[PDB]
Amino acid sequence: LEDLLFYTIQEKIPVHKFITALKSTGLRTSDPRLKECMDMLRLTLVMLDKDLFKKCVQSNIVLLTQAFRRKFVIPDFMSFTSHIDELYESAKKQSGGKVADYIPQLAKFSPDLWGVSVCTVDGQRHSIGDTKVPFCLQSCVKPLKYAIAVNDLGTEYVHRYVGKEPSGFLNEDDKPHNPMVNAGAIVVTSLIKQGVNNAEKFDYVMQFLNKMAGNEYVGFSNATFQSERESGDRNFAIGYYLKEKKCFPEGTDMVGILDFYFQLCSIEVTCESASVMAATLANGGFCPITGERVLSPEAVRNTLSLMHSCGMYDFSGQFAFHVGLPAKSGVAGGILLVVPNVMGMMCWSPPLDKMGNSVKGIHFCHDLVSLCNFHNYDNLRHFAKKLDPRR
Amino acid sequence: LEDLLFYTIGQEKIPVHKFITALKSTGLRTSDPRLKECMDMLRLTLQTVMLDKDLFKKCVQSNIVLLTQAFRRKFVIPDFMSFTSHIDELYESAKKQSGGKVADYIPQLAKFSPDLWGVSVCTVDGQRHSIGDTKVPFCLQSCVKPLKYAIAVNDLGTEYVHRYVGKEPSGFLNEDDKPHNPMVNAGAIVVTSLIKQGVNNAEKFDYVMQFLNKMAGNEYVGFSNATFQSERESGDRNFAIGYYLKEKKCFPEGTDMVGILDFYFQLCSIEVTCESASVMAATLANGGFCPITGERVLSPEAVRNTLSLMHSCGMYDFSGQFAFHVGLPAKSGVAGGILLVVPNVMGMMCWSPPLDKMGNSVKGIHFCHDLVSLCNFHNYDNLRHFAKKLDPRR
Amino acid sequence: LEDLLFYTIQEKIPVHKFITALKSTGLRTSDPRLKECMDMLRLTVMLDKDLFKKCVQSNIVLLTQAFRRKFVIPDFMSFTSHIDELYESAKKQSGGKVADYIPQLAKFSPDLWGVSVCTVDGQRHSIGDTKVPFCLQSCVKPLKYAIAVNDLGTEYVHRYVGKEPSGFLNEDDKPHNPMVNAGAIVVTSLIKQGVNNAEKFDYVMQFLNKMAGNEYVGFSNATFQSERESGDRNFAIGYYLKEKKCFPEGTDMVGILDFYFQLCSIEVTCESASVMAATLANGGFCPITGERVLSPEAVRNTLSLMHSCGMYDFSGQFAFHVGLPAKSGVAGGILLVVPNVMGMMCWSPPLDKMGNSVKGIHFCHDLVSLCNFHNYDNLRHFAKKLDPRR
Amino acid sequence: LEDLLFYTIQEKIPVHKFITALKSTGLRTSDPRLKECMDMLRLTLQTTGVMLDKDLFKKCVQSNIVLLTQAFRRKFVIPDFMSFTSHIDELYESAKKQSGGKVADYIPQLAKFSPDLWGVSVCTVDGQRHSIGDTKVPFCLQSCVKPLKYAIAVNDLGTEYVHRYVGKEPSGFLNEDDKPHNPMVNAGAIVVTSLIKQGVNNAEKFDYVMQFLNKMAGNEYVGFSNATFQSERESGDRNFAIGYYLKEKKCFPEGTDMVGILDFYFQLCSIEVTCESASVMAATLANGGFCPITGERVLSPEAVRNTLSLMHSCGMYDFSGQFAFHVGLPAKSGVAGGILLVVPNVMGMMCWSPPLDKMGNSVKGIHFCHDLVSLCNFHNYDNLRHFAKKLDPRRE
């Protein structure tokens, strides 16, 4: 079996030929799942006989077979990624929109910063633009923490304190409308890891985002967090209103919960790391790169459902109709995009349109679904003129 | 090729019923339009009970492609009898919910027994199953809303249609002075004004009728005049809407509102059965292609938009919860029918008269929750990791 | 006493001297209450103590009350001069757009402006074009509400309609108030439920006749036809009310809408309409005929709702600033009531953005700005305002 | 002149007889306007008899003759006070039999008041006084202070400025113009609070308002409950939410400390009055800014006009529209169970019972107000010339 891949790649094969063929499939040599194989190549170090090849490739053979036999959701990645660069370049030319000035940290970012990162459910990676520049999740974290809550607590409990539908502060039942709005996000924040101090709660959530991202970059911006606390009049009013209406679980410290809320909003990521988080959501709770199970299918289901209707702010309904993909946006200019069973994505540009969404990101998401059939209600069998990367 | 099949069915001669029996186990019905030539030749040959390589080849030759897929288990649900058995359990479970109230606002709806319950399944490959009362005619009512909206977009395209109507749910008119969506009476009335403009109601009606006939694979589609007359007597609500829409200039130029309402009431009065309606849903799940006729009815654009709205707006006020828990595009009506669509897989019609507080069929809502609970068909369920759920696609 | 009045005026009084003095009191010789006196005068230039008392004796109470300065506004000539100033100041506002939704309304000249005043004591003043007939439109809403309450009582009337502002149906599933189309449509269904539509219309007409002291009241079939031709909003409301069962059982909703349109199509003039207002200000008693048209209950409720609901969307602001119960209509008329003092009809065609007459509103502000007539103004300490009652 | 009066009330007048006649007018011997006359009677009584003669009466009533003349000449707004007084008692006794309602428990201070407490105080525009029930028991103004502090703002700042930050009409937190609907809602009151006495500390603001309330009450009891204030600022989640929202929407004037304003707000709610003291405040409103008993001008006619217009529509909470339609009087209520009632040009009142109904208004107060208008024509839109079964205390 290790020998087949060998012939598939002629008495002896050079390393760079095996590596290039590997990178071709969309995989990265730094992939955690390939670690054992890459450790061996380190020791071996130029030409590989049947024996040496089999020696290094053993542990990781199953994953390597899938890549080379093109079993991945997108068999031809190189062509698909070329399309991604087109859409990226196409969106790059939209200079409209406004960068958030409400805090110095948001205003400091250049409007020209633009990047897109793709991570499939099989771990295939592609990046273009500025994908390595750290930025705060802001509202993009709302789906993530909601997932954590539903994962730990469960659906029945979590929705006792919050609503499952769009709006149009509280609903008929005196619950916030959903987890994707500040009022609802705040309540969700109070549900996580009850009984411990903010430090531990924050360590717990942080560990969780690390799992979703396959231990890729996750960080915290204290500068943003501090300015978030000073300008938080809007959220304080909500916090007091929730407290008054008894929306919080018993024993809750409201003023403290708000600071945790601001902390979570100040969490830093990159297009690349975030795309892995979205891929976990598209992969049913399993981190595509690490293969580990981060979230229960129940949590991922609920989150994608609410990201669908509630994710884009006031542009949600429009977005659900035209784009048909679950997504979440934040004032940093990030858009966390998920294509179920296919991939996950993070688009980042600071300038936002009048509705609070990234101009480029929105332009990119539209073109994406126009090009391929990722639309939730697109038909796999008959898509018309659309392109299916899965074939 | 045809010979390959013949071998799959041991001895030199095949009993004619053996082939038919094995055929049926696929969920396919011998009356299937795509099977006519095979079945015609089969009874003609049977006129002059055994088959041979060259005989079975003579009968199956014309339809060979479909037969192969059926016997090779290439259909979306490869094991139909298993999936079928589950459907019955779900049906049998929902049958035990006797709650709900049959709609009395007109004599026609009130006449129906609370105990009438049935479900029909038509997959994207034309696989068929029914249990309960699937042969009883009933009006679509609001179930027609998505169907006539699909027809509008198909002919007029998206830009034009939604110029007069909204694409989202509602907490009469939205901020743009348009009905919130096609799934509400106001929106449905405007959609009705868009179809087949410039002609009389009789022509418009026939235009939609043939259209529904295609979606149903020429299965039963009918009209209840008794319901139509009652509908137009009791229509104060919809008449109020018509004048408001007229006042707010929500109709295409040269529109007769009173005439549109009449067309509207007729479209609600169009009647079907669980079985024929199941094919309708399947066509929506098939991307616009009628599963049993293999014929193109609606454009992928029209079908997509229709499913998008059935997701959010289809369930009345229970839409938000239905979308969250069930996660399937569906439409409900006062007759107690629920038009259900599982994309890429199948479509159904669940019909019971008794309605809940929301106006949705009690047994239908129950059945849908169980279906998605049992199976991974939920919109955001994962095709790779579904946990405890079942995947009938294997 | 008729002797008394005589010396108040030589051994001989010429009629013109008596006639001039009387007009000065704000009264008209055409006044229905002075009919007997005026009959005698024509039945007879100069006259003595005996001939005077002969003509005057029958009206002596009103005449003595007038000449003794007992009328609500003792000095009318001054007050009249102020009304003219306000009229002239408002005359300079040409902004506003005449209502075009029907031909009849669009025909009216933007420059048509008039003000009529009728006190509770029958004093009359008019300036501008006060003799020109125009449709009451929404100005009739309080009038037909007063009629309803009068006949049916407050308890019955308010099962079908709300008592307060809005900001179609309230929580109770009733129209918010009588001053909005939805409510006026329901109110219209309450009146004379037994008879046919022709008799109903006659009944209201006669009622409006008493209210106007038998002054001009008329009907425009032109407006009525145009009105019913475009009813879509009002038909929309009608069907919604019918569906919500907001009408009294046995009602023909569609027939009612006809009646509704007819009522909006009734014609008045600034002068005749000002009397209608004066009746509302006088507690249901027509100032000039001394007759009792409306119950004090109907008048109280009517003035209450005109206060909050009368001005369309400008009602709240009008109540806060002007502080007078009033009703406005699409024809550009404003039915103004100053309780215990007088009543008025301000008419100019051009509407403002809120649907109220531009000049009319301008006039109402200056009036309350100049005088203490504001609802919550204090009679004792009003500061720099004028009190015409003194 | 003083002689005329002397006769109209033998060759000599017993002092108690003059005192008994004066009290009949509804006036009080404690009337600040009567002090000179009253000091004289006491002094004179020392230097002599118990009996008074022409020359002597001339000595005592000389200074106050004007007011005394109008009292004995039946020229007060209500000529027969004792008949009217007799009626007020009947209404009080009728309303007293309504045992429904729940006393506000949201803080300890309100719950401590017994449900049985019921009282009504009347002060006419001429200073005529009547009280029945418990009118001497102190209680916090609460929302009853809303129109008062708003009047102070309009008096100092005028209408145009004050209403930039607040709406002039009912609701149905912010209106279409992004302002609080009116001064009578917590959101509006909090904004009105920010307008008063800017540039100075809370202790100064509080004193400035306090002395203003003293004028309106004719220097009768005005007090502060710290027990209630502390409880108020612990329970203020609702108002803190509003404050932050107001702060976010830029509703406050420049350089405004919101948390400091909320504290000032709670203090104003905690100010204590009695039915008798408060009734005088209401009468000052009915008198057009003049305190009936002191004859002093507290507020501008403009300030009072606006306040009454808003009390009319916005004063009763959600019962405002119904109240305005039936009762037809400007009024304000508070969680303490007090109702500040004003009859323009006639009198002013304070009705107090702790138990509140579903709408937050005291059952007894509301019941009383209804009977009050049923009996007499005080309705804003009642006619002075024509009323049906109603009686007119202003008529002889």
Ligand SMILES: N[C@@H](CCC(=O)O)C(=O)O
């Ligand atoms: N930290 C901000 C982010 C707002 C947003 O991204 O929409 C908040 O929670 O209000």
Ligand SMILES: N[C@@H](CCC(=O)O)C(=O)O
């Ligand atoms: N024809 C009925 C259908 C109602 C419904 O199914 O919701 C109507 O327009 O009211």
Ligand SMILES: N[C@@H](CCC(=O)O)C(=O)O
């Ligand atoms: N006849 C018009 C009158 C509108 C108005 O006067 O404001 C209607 O009923 O709508």
Ligand SMILES: N[C@@H](CCC(=O)O)C(=O)O
């Ligand atoms: N002082 C409390 C209650 C006022 C009241 O409603 O009486 C507040 O401002 O919320």
